[PDB]
Design a binder for these strands. Structure first.
Length: 209
DNA sequence: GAGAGCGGCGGAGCCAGCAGGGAGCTGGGA
Protein backbone atom coordinates (compact mmCIF):
# COMPACT_ATOMS: atom_id res chain seq x y z
CA UNK A 1 0.00 0.00 0.00
CA UNK A 2 1.00 3.66 -0.26
CA UNK A 3 1.29 3.97 3.54
CA UNK A 4 3.39 0.80 3.60
CA UNK A 5 5.73 2.16 0.94
CA UNK A 6 6.01 5.50 2.77
CA UNK A 7 6.98 3.53 5.89
CA UNK A 8 9.48 1.63 3.74
CA UNK A 9 11.11 4.87 2.56
CA UNK A 10 11.25 6.29 6.10
CA UNK A 11 12.77 3.11 7.54
CA UNK A 12 15.35 2.84 4.77
CA UNK A 13 16.31 6.50 5.31
CA UNK A 14 16.75 5.77 9.03
CA UNK A 15 18.98 2.81 8.15
CA UNK A 16 21.04 5.01 5.81
CA UNK A 17 21.47 7.56 8.61
CA UNK A 18 22.59 4.86 11.06
CA UNK A 19 25.00 3.44 8.47
CA UNK A 20 26.48 6.89 7.77
CA UNK A 21 26.87 7.51 11.50
CA UNK A 22 28.57 4.14 12.04
CA UNK A 23 30.92 4.72 9.09
CA UNK A 24 32.25 7.87 10.78
CA UNK A 25 30.45 10.58 8.81
CA UNK A 26 28.62 13.57 10.28
CA UNK A 27 24.86 13.30 10.76
CA UNK A 28 22.55 15.40 12.90
CA UNK A 29 20.72 13.92 15.87
CA UNK A 30 17.26 14.84 14.56
CA UNK A 31 18.30 13.30 11.25
CA UNK A 32 19.14 10.16 13.21
CA UNK A 33 15.71 10.02 14.89
CA UNK A 34 12.92 11.01 12.49
CA UNK A 35 9.39 9.79 13.13
CA UNK A 36 6.94 8.67 10.45
CA UNK A 37 4.81 11.80 10.86
CA UNK A 38 7.87 14.07 10.75
CA UNK A 39 9.19 12.30 7.64
CA UNK A 40 5.77 12.61 5.97
CA UNK A 41 5.65 16.32 6.82
CA UNK A 42 9.18 16.86 5.49
CA UNK A 43 9.01 14.89 2.23
CA UNK A 44 5.35 14.23 1.39
CA UNK A 45 2.58 11.88 2.43
CA UNK A 46 1.73 10.01 -0.78
CA UNK A 47 4.80 9.08 -2.87
CA UNK A 48 2.90 7.44 -5.72
CA UNK A 49 1.98 10.25 -8.19
CA UNK A 50 3.10 12.65 -5.46
CA UNK A 51 5.91 14.68 -3.95
CA UNK A 52 8.54 12.13 -2.67
CA UNK A 53 9.64 10.64 -5.99
CA UNK A 54 12.83 8.80 -4.81
CA UNK A 55 14.97 11.60 -6.33
CA UNK A 56 14.81 14.18 -3.53
CA UNK A 57 15.98 11.60 -0.95
CA UNK A 58 19.69 11.93 -1.77
CA UNK A 59 21.82 12.84 1.25
CA UNK A 60 24.96 14.97 1.50
CA UNK A 61 27.25 13.82 4.31
CA UNK A 62 30.90 14.53 5.05
CA UNK A 63 33.50 12.89 7.25
CA UNK A 64 34.17 14.13 10.77
CA UNK A 65 37.92 14.54 10.29
CA UNK A 66 37.83 15.79 6.68
CA UNK A 67 34.99 18.07 5.48
CA UNK A 68 35.84 17.26 1.83
CA UNK A 69 35.16 13.51 1.89
CA UNK A 70 31.62 14.26 0.68
CA UNK A 71 29.83 10.92 0.38
CA UNK A 72 26.39 10.76 -1.25
CA UNK A 73 23.64 8.17 -1.44
CA UNK A 74 21.41 7.64 -4.46
CA UNK A 75 17.96 6.10 -4.90
CA UNK A 76 17.50 5.12 -8.57
CA UNK A 77 14.09 5.44 -10.17
CA UNK A 78 13.96 2.20 -12.15
CA UNK A 79 13.91 -1.15 -10.31
CA UNK A 80 16.48 -2.64 -12.72
CA UNK A 81 19.48 -0.33 -12.50
CA UNK A 82 21.53 -0.43 -15.68
CA UNK A 83 24.65 0.95 -17.35
CA UNK A 84 22.77 4.05 -18.53
CA UNK A 85 21.58 4.96 -15.02
CA UNK A 86 24.97 4.18 -13.47
CA UNK A 87 26.71 6.25 -16.16
CA UNK A 88 24.38 9.17 -15.39
CA UNK A 89 25.10 8.82 -11.66
CA UNK A 90 28.87 8.57 -12.23
CA UNK A 91 28.90 11.58 -14.56
CA UNK A 92 27.01 13.54 -11.89
CA UNK A 93 29.59 12.28 -9.40
CA UNK A 94 32.18 13.74 -11.77
CA UNK A 95 30.84 17.32 -11.89
CA UNK A 96 30.20 17.56 -8.16
CA UNK A 97 33.67 15.95 -7.82
CA UNK A 98 33.01 13.37 -5.10
CA UNK A 99 34.59 9.94 -4.80
CA UNK A 100 32.23 7.66 -2.86
CA UNK A 101 28.54 6.86 -3.24
CA UNK A 102 25.85 4.34 -2.31
CA UNK A 103 23.22 3.00 -4.71
CA UNK A 104 19.97 1.74 -3.17
CA UNK A 105 18.52 -0.57 -5.80
CA UNK A 106 14.85 -1.54 -5.58
CA UNK A 107 15.25 -5.23 -6.47
CA UNK A 108 18.42 -5.83 -8.47
CA UNK A 109 20.73 -4.41 -11.10
CA UNK A 110 21.95 -6.03 -14.29
CA UNK A 111 25.16 -8.12 -14.30
CA UNK A 112 26.70 -5.72 -16.82
CA UNK A 113 25.96 -2.85 -14.43
CA UNK A 114 27.41 -4.66 -11.42
CA UNK A 115 30.50 -5.43 -13.51
CA UNK A 116 30.74 -1.76 -14.50
CA UNK A 117 30.78 -0.98 -10.78
CA UNK A 118 33.92 -3.13 -10.52
CA UNK A 119 35.45 -1.51 -13.61
CA UNK A 120 34.81 1.98 -12.20
CA UNK A 121 36.16 1.02 -8.75
CA UNK A 122 39.65 2.71 -8.52
CA UNK A 123 38.67 6.33 -9.20
CA UNK A 124 35.15 6.14 -7.72
CA UNK A 125 33.82 3.83 -5.01
CA UNK A 126 30.40 2.39 -5.88
CA UNK A 127 28.49 0.04 -3.58
CA UNK A 128 25.31 -1.89 -4.41
CA UNK A 129 22.61 -2.09 -1.75
CA UNK A 130 19.23 -3.74 -2.12
CA UNK A 131 16.10 -2.15 -0.68
CA UNK A 132 15.34 -5.43 1.10
CA UNK A 133 18.76 -5.45 2.80
CA UNK A 134 18.44 -1.92 4.16
CA UNK A 135 14.94 -2.35 5.57
CA UNK A 136 16.52 -3.23 8.93
CA UNK A 137 19.80 -2.57 10.73
CA UNK A 138 21.65 -5.87 11.09
CA UNK A 139 24.05 -4.49 13.72
CA UNK A 140 21.20 -4.26 16.25
CA UNK A 141 20.62 -8.03 16.19
CA UNK A 142 21.53 -9.95 19.34
CA UNK A 143 23.60 -12.44 17.34
CA UNK A 144 25.77 -9.75 15.71
CA UNK A 145 28.49 -8.45 18.06
CA UNK A 146 30.18 -5.06 17.93
CA UNK A 147 32.51 -4.45 14.98
CA UNK A 148 35.22 -1.77 15.18
CA UNK A 149 37.29 -0.75 12.17
CA UNK A 150 40.99 -0.56 13.00
CA UNK A 151 43.43 2.03 11.71
CA UNK A 152 46.69 1.15 9.98
CA UNK A 153 48.83 2.17 12.97
CA UNK A 154 46.68 0.03 15.27
CA UNK A 155 47.01 -2.93 12.89
CA UNK A 156 50.80 -2.47 12.76
CA UNK A 157 50.97 -2.31 16.56
CA UNK A 158 48.81 -5.45 16.79
CA UNK A 159 51.01 -7.41 14.38
CA UNK A 160 54.13 -6.23 16.22
CA UNK A 161 52.69 -7.19 19.61
CA UNK A 162 51.52 -10.69 18.69
CA UNK A 163 54.39 -11.25 16.19
CA UNK A 164 51.93 -12.28 13.49
CA UNK A 165 51.72 -12.09 9.73
CA UNK A 166 48.55 -11.02 7.96
CA UNK A 167 47.95 -14.57 6.70
CA UNK A 168 47.74 -16.02 10.22
CA UNK A 169 44.77 -13.87 11.26
CA UNK A 170 41.18 -15.10 10.93
CA UNK A 171 39.43 -13.86 7.82
CA UNK A 172 36.16 -12.21 6.83
CA UNK A 173 34.93 -11.92 3.25
CA UNK A 174 34.33 -8.57 1.58
CA UNK A 175 30.82 -9.74 0.66
CA UNK A 176 29.89 -10.23 4.31
CA UNK A 177 26.79 -8.23 5.33
CA UNK A 178 28.64 -6.49 8.18
CA UNK A 179 31.59 -5.82 5.86
CA UNK A 180 29.28 -4.20 3.31
CA UNK A 181 27.52 -2.29 6.10
CA UNK A 182 30.80 -0.75 7.23
CA UNK A 183 32.07 -0.36 3.67
CA UNK A 184 35.32 -2.13 4.50
CA UNK A 185 37.73 -3.14 1.74
CA UNK A 186 40.44 -5.72 1.17
CA UNK A 187 43.47 -5.57 3.45
CA UNK A 188 41.78 -3.87 6.41
CA UNK A 189 41.35 -5.49 9.83
CA UNK A 190 38.05 -5.39 11.73
CA UNK A 191 38.00 -5.78 15.52
CA UNK A 192 35.19 -7.79 17.12
CA UNK A 193 34.30 -7.40 20.80
CA UNK A 194 31.85 -9.98 22.10
CA UNK A 195 30.70 -11.13 25.55
CA UNK A 196 32.21 -14.38 26.78
CA UNK A 197 30.57 -17.11 28.83
CA UNK A 198 33.85 -18.10 30.50
CA UNK A 199 35.95 -14.92 30.58
CA UNK A 200 33.32 -12.17 30.32
CA UNK A 201 34.82 -10.31 27.37
CA UNK A 202 36.76 -11.57 24.35
CA UNK A 203 38.31 -9.58 21.49
CA UNK A 204 38.77 -11.12 18.04
CA UNK A 205 40.56 -9.60 15.05
CA UNK A 206 39.57 -10.48 11.48
CA UNK A 207 41.31 -9.59 8.22
CA UNK A 208 39.15 -8.57 5.26
CA UNK A 209 40.73 -10.67 2.51
C1' DG B 1 50.63 -93.41 -28.97
C1' DA B 2 51.59 -91.80 -24.40
C1' DG B 3 53.38 -87.90 -22.07
C1' DA B 4 53.08 -83.10 -21.93
C1' DG B 5 53.51 -77.98 -22.17
C1' DC B 6 51.96 -73.99 -23.62
C1' DG B 7 48.46 -71.54 -26.77
C1' DG B 8 43.75 -69.70 -26.64
C1' DC B 9 39.10 -68.60 -24.63
C1' DG B 10 21.37 -48.53 -2.12
C1' DG B 11 21.04 -44.11 -0.50
C1' DA B 12 22.62 -39.21 0.32
C1' DG B 13 25.10 -35.07 -1.05
C1' DC B 14 28.79 -31.65 -3.56
C1' DC B 15 30.72 -30.52 -8.82
C1' DA B 16 30.55 -30.42 -14.25
C1' DG B 17 27.68 -29.47 -18.18
C1' DC B 18 24.27 -27.84 -21.01
C1' DA B 19 20.07 -25.13 -22.06
C1' DG B 20 17.07 -21.62 -21.95
C1' DG B 21 16.43 -16.72 -21.18
C1' DG B 22 17.22 -11.49 -20.80
C1' DA B 23 20.73 -6.89 -21.35
C1' DG B 24 23.35 -4.64 -24.71
C1' DC B 25 25.78 -3.16 -28.65
C1' DT B 26 25.74 -2.79 -33.79
C1' DG B 27 24.28 -2.17 -38.89
C1' DG B 28 20.36 -0.69 -41.59
C1' DG B 29 17.03 2.53 -42.87
C1' DA B 30 13.50 6.93 -40.97
Amino acid sequence: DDEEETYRLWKIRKTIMQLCHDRGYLVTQDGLDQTLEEFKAQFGGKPSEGRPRRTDLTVLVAHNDDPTDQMFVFFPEEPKVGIKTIKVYCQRMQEENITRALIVVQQGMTPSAKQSLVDMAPKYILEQFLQQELLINITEHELVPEHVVMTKEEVTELLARYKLRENQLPRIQAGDPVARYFGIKRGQVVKIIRPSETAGRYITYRLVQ
